Design an enzyme around this catalytic site. Structure first.
Site, short mmCIF file in Angstrom:
data_model
loop_
_atom_site.label_atom_id
_atom_site.label_comp_id
_atom_site.label_asym_id
_atom_site.label_seq_id
_atom_site.Cartn_x
_atom_site.Cartn_y
_atom_site.Cartn_z
N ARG A 149 47.83 31.08 54.51
CA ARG A 149 48.88 30.21 54.20
C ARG A 149 49.73 29.45 54.98
NH1 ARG A 149 51.48 30.39 48.32
NH2 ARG A 149 53.61 29.57 48.63
N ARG B 128 42.64 29.54 49.89
CA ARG B 128 43.49 30.57 49.69
C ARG B 128 42.93 32.02 50.43
NH1 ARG B 128 47.06 31.12 45.44
NH2 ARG B 128 47.76 29.09 45.11
N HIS C 154 47.10 38.91 39.94
CA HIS C 154 46.03 38.11 40.45
C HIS C 154 44.65 38.88 40.84
CE1 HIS C 154 48.17 34.51 40.85
NE2 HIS C 154 49.33 35.09 41.67
N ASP D 2 44.29 28.43 34.86
CA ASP D 2 43.24 28.11 35.79
C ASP D 2 41.97 27.91 35.12
OD1 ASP D 2 45.05 28.33 37.94
OD2 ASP D 2 44.32 30.16 38.63
N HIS E 115 57.88 33.61 34.58
CA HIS E 115 57.05 33.21 35.70
C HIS E 115 57.62 32.11 36.18
CE1 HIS E 115 53.66 33.87 38.03
NE2 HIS E 115 53.49 32.68 38.09
N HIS F 185 55.99 34.84 40.13
CA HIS F 185 55.60 33.51 40.63
C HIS F 185 56.09 33.35 42.03
CE1 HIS F 185 54.79 29.25 40.64
NE2 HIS F 185 55.87 28.92 40.85
N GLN G 246 56.60 35.76 44.19
CA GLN G 246 55.72 36.86 44.60
C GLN G 246 56.88 37.40 45.85
OE1 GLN G 246 51.66 34.87 43.82
NE2 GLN G 246 51.64 36.33 45.42
N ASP H 185 52.52 39.08 39.07
CA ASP H 185 51.56 38.36 39.90
C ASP H 185 50.15 39.22 40.49
OD1 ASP H 185 52.82 35.53 40.64
OD2 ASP H 185 54.31 37.18 40.18
N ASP I 177 50.59 35.88 35.47
CA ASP I 177 49.76 35.45 36.76
C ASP I 177 48.62 36.68 37.10
OD1 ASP I 177 50.49 32.62 37.44
OD2 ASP I 177 50.89 33.10 39.23
N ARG J 101 48.87 25.07 54.86
CA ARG J 101 49.98 24.46 54.32
C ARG J 101 50.90 23.89 55.25
NH1 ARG J 101 51.58 26.76 48.42
NH2 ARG J 101 49.58 28.08 47.90
N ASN K 7 51.59 30.40 35.68
CA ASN K 7 50.67 29.26 35.63
C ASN K 7 49.15 29.46 35.80
OD1 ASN K 7 52.02 30.00 38.26
ND2 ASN K 7 50.69 28.65 39.15
N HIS K 8 48.90 30.47 36.44
CA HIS K 8 47.39 31.09 36.84
C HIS K 8 46.74 31.09 35.41
CE1 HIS K 8 46.87 29.72 41.12
NE2 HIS K 8 48.26 29.96 40.98
N1 LIG Z 1 43.93 25.73 39.34
C1 LIG Z 1 44.27 25.28 40.72
N2 LIG Z 1 43.24 24.26 41.17
C2 LIG Z 1 43.38 23.80 42.47
N3 LIG Z 1 44.62 24.09 43.09
C3 LIG Z 1 45.32 24.89 42.61
C4 LIG Z 1 45.36 25.54 41.45
N4 LIG Z 1 46.31 26.51 41.19
C5 LIG Z 1 47.24 26.29 42.30
N5 LIG Z 1 46.49 25.44 43.25
C6 LIG Z 1 47.35 25.20 44.61
O1 LIG Z 1 48.17 26.22 44.87
C7 LIG Z 1 49.53 25.60 45.19
C8 LIG Z 1 50.55 26.52 44.37
O2 LIG Z 1 50.75 27.43 44.93
P1 LIG Z 1 52.12 28.22 44.97
O3 LIG Z 1 51.83 29.36 46.00
O4 LIG Z 1 53.20 27.32 45.45
C9 LIG Z 1 52.18 28.67 43.45
P2 LIG Z 1 51.31 29.94 42.67
O5 LIG Z 1 49.96 29.36 42.94
O6 LIG Z 1 51.51 31.16 43.52
O7 LIG Z 1 51.74 30.10 41.26
C10 LIG Z 1 49.24 24.14 44.34
O8 LIG Z 1 50.12 23.31 44.79
C11 LIG Z 1 47.89 23.80 44.67
O9 LIG Z 1 47.73 23.31 46.05
MN LIG Z 2 51.31 34.21 41.59
MN LIG Z 3 52.37 31.51 39.97
#
Ligand SMILES: Nc1ncnc2c1ncn2[C@@H]1O[C@H](COP(=O)(O)CP(=O)(O)O)[C@@H](O)[C@H]1O
Ligand SMILES: [Mn+2]
Ligand SMILES: [Mn+2]
Length: 525
Positions: free
Chosen positions: A350, A385, A18, A95, A192, A227, A229, A16, A59, A354, A91-92
Site C-alpha cells: 500500500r 492489495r 476482511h 464488493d 463503518h 474502516h 483500520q 474490518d 467489512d 498508492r 463498504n466491502h
Molecule cells: N470493489 C472494489 N473494486 C475495485 N477497487 C476497489 C474496490 N473496493 C475498494 N477498491 C479500491 O480501494 C480503495 C479504497 O481503499 P481504502 O483503504 O481507502 C478504504 P477500504 O477499502 O479499506 O474500505 C478505492 O479507492 C479503490 O481504489
Molecule cells: Mn476495511
Molecule cells: Mn472500509
C-alpha cells in the site's frame, strides 16, 4: 431501571475482519481463538452479574482468497459461533451483488445494520437502521451507519439505485426517533466510518470524530467503529498513538461526551469496554484491546530470531475449527499450485502502489493490454492489495493481489480523448486509493497539464485512435476516474481480473522483473 442500582455492561467489538476466519501463518488471530476468548469473557461477566454485547464495525468481506471465493460464508458462520449481536455494514459488503449480501444476512444470525443506505427509486432503507437488546431490565439500542464514501470508492455498477446519505445527519434523525418512540436506556452506534485525529478526515468522507461532535452531548454512550483500520488508542488529546503496541494500555477517544473505539483489523484484537450504568449515567470504567495471539519478534545472538506471544496463548476452539476447516481446505490444492515464477519481488505494498509506479502495476496492466490488444492502460493503486515475493507464484498469490473480482474492459478513443483522459487521471494524488498506475504512458506533469505525452514512446496524435485497457471499476467512474462506459468504443470483456493475470503469468513465466520496472516514464512536478 432500578433506582440507584449499578449495572455492569461489557461491550466487546472488532471490525474490518476482511476474510480472516483462519489463523495466519504465525498462529495469530483467527475466529477459533476469538471464540475461546469471548466465551471466557462471557463466563467472567455472567459470574460478576453483568451483561455482554458484542459488535462488529463491518467489512467482513474481502481480503483472504479462501474466504473471498466462498462469499465469506465461513466468516459469517464463524461470527454466529462467536456470538455477535450486531454488525454495521461496511463498504466491502458491496464488493459483491446485493443478492450475495442478502445471502450473507440469511447466514448471519445477527442483524447487519445501516440506517443511512437507501434505495433511490423508493426513498426507503435497504437495511434495518438499528436493533434493540434487553440486558437485565435495560433497553439498549444499537444503530448502524456506513461511510458515504462507499459509492465513491466502490464499484459503480452496484450503486445505480442505491444512495448513501450522510451518516452524521442520519444519526441525528435516528437518535431523535429512538428517544421519542423507543426510549432506550443506552444508545450505541456501530459504524463503518473511520477515526481521524481531531476530525481531520481530509479528502475522506467525515467519520466518527466529526459525527460525535455534531451530535447532542453524550447522546451515544459509545461509537464502535471501523474502516480506517486503527487501534483507537490516544497518545494525547486528539492524537492516536502511532505504532500502537499489543498488550499496552489503550485509551479510547472521547469527543463531546461520546467514547470512540476501534480494534484495528482482521480479528487482531477484541476490544473490551467495561461500563457501569446507574440512574441514566453510563461510565466507562475500563477499556482495553485484547490481542488475539499476536506475536512479536525477538532476536538471539545466535543469529536466530523467533516469534513470541505478547500475552498468554488463547486456545483455538475445537467446535470452531471443525466448522471452518471444510472452508479453509476447499480447493486447497488448486489454489496452491505453481502458475509461474518471478526472479524478483513484485511491489504491491500500500505505501508504494498508492504513492509511486510499481512493477506490480506494470505487470497487471501488461496482462490486461495483452488480453485486449490495448496500446496503453491504467488502474487505481487501491486495486492492488498485495505483493508477490521473488520465487514461485500460485493462483492464491494472484487472488491476494486482486481480490475484487473486477472485470477487464477496454475503450477505443481518439488522441484528443487520450490526452484529456490521462490529464484528468494524472491529477489523482498520492496517498489515495485513486493514485494511478500507468503502462505504456510517459509524460511530465506540471500545473495540471501533461508535457511530453507519449503512448509507447510516440507522441499522441489527436486524430489517431488508441485502445486502452483498465477495469470495469475505473471505467464506470470508480475512484472518480473519467467515465468511459458512457462513450462509444467501450467494451466489457467479462474476463475476471485475476483470471487474466493468472493466464498471463503462466505463459510469460519465468518473469524477469526487469521488464516491468518503472523507469520514471511518468513524472510530476
Ligand atoms: N470493489 C472494489 N473494486 C475495485 N477497487 C476497489 C474496490 N473496493 C475498494 N477498491 C479500491 O480501494 C480503495 C479504497 O481503499 P481504502 O483503504 O481507502 C478504504 P477500504 O477499502 O479499506 O474500505 C478505492 O479507492 C479503490 O481504489
Ligand atoms: Mn476495511
Ligand atoms: Mn472500509
Amino acid at each position: 431501571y432500578e433506582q440507584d442500582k449499578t449495572y455492569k455492561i461489557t461491550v466487546l467489538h472488532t471490525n474490518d475482519h476482511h476474510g480472516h476466519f483462519w489463523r495466519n501463518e504465525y498462529g495469530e488471530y483467527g475466529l477459533a481463538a476469538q471464540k475461546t476468548l469471548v466465551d471466557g469473557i462471557r463466563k467472567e461477566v455472567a459470574a460478576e452479574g453483568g451483561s455482554v454485547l458484542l459488535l462488529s464495525g463491518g467489512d467482513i468481506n474481502t481480503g483472504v482468497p479462501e474466504s473471498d471465493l466462498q462469499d465469506a460464508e465461513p466468516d459469517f458462520r464463524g461470527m454466529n459461533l462467536v456470538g455477535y449481536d450486531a454488525m454495521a455494514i461496511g463498504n466491502h459488503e458491496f464488493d459483491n451483488p446485493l443478492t450475495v449480501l442478502r445471502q450473507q444476512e440469511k447466514w448471519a444470525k445477527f442483524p447487519l445494520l445501516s440506517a443511512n443506505i437507501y434505495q433511490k427509486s423508493t426513498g426507503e432503507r435497504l437495511f434495518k437502521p438499528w436493533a434493540l437488546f434487553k440486558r437485565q431490565d435495560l433497553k439498549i439500542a444499537v444503530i448502524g451507519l456506513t461511510t458515504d464514501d462507499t459509492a465513491k470508492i466502490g464499484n459503480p455498477e452496484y450503486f445505480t439505485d442505491i444512495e448513501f446519505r450522510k451518516p452524521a445527519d442520519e444519526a441525528k434523525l435516528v437518535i431523535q426517533e429512538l428517544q421519542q418512540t423507543e426510549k432506550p436506556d443506552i444508545i450505541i452506534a456501530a459504524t463503518h466510518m473511520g477515526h481521524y485525529d481531531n476530525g481531520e478526515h481530509g479528502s475522506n468522507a467525515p467519520g466518527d470524530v466529526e459525527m460525535a461532535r455534531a451530535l447532542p452531548a453524550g447522546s451515544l454512550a459509545m461509537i464502535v467503529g471501523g474502516h480506517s483500520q486503527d487501534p483507537v488508542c490516544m497518545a494525547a488529546e486528539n492524537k492516536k498513538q502511532v505504532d500502537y503496541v499489543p498488550g499496552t494500555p489503550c485509551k479510547p477517544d472521547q469527543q463531546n461526551g461520546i467514547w470512540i473505539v476501534q480494534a484495528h483489523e482482521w480479528g487482531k484484537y477484541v476490544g473490551r469496554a467495561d461500563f457501569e450504568f446507574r440512574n441514566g449515567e453510563m461510565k466507562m470504567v475500563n477499556y482495553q484491546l485484547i490481542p488475539v495471539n499476536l506475536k512479536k519478534k525477538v532476536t538471539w545472538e545466535d543469529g536466530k530470531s523467533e516469534r513470541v506471544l505478547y500475552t498468554p496463548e488463547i486456545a483455538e476452539n475445537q467446535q470452531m475449527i471443525s466448522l471452518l476447516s471444510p472452508f479453509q481446505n476447499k480447493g486447497k490444492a488448486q489454489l496452491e499450485v505453481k502458475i509461474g515464477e518471478t526472479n524478483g519481488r513484485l511491489e504491491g505494498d500500500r505505501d508504494k502502489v498508492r504513492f509511486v509506479q510499481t512493477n506490480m502495476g506494470r505487470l497487471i496492466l501488461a496482462a490486461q493490454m495483452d488480453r485486449t490488444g490495448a496500446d496503453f492502460a491504467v488502474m487505481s493503486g487501491g486495486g492492488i492489495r498485495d505483493s508477490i515475493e521473488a520465487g514461485d507464484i500460485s493462483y492464491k498469490n494472484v487472488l491476494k493481489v486482486q481480490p475484487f473480482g473486477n472485470v477487464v474492459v477496454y475503450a477505443d478513443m481518439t488522441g484528443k480523448e487520450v490526452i484529456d483522459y490521462l490529464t484528468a487521471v494524472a491529477q489523482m494524488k498520492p496517498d489515495s486509493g485513486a493514485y494511478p498506475q500507468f503502462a505504456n504512458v510517459s509524460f511530465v506533469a506540471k500545473d495540471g497539464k501533461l508535457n511530453d505525452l507519449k503512448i509507447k514512446g510516440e507522441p499522441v496524435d489527436p486524430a489517431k485512435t488508441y485502445r486502452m485497457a483498465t477495469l470495469n471499476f475505473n471505467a464506470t467512474g470508480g475512484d472518480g476516474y473519467p467515465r468511459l462506459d458512457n462513450k462509444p468504443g467501450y467494451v466489457n470483456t467479462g474476463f475476471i481480473d485475476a483470471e487474466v493475470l493468472k493466464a498471463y503469468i503462466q505463459k510469460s513465466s519465468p518473469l524477469d522483473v526487469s521488464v516491468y520496472e518503472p523507469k520514471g516514464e511518468v513524472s510530476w512536478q
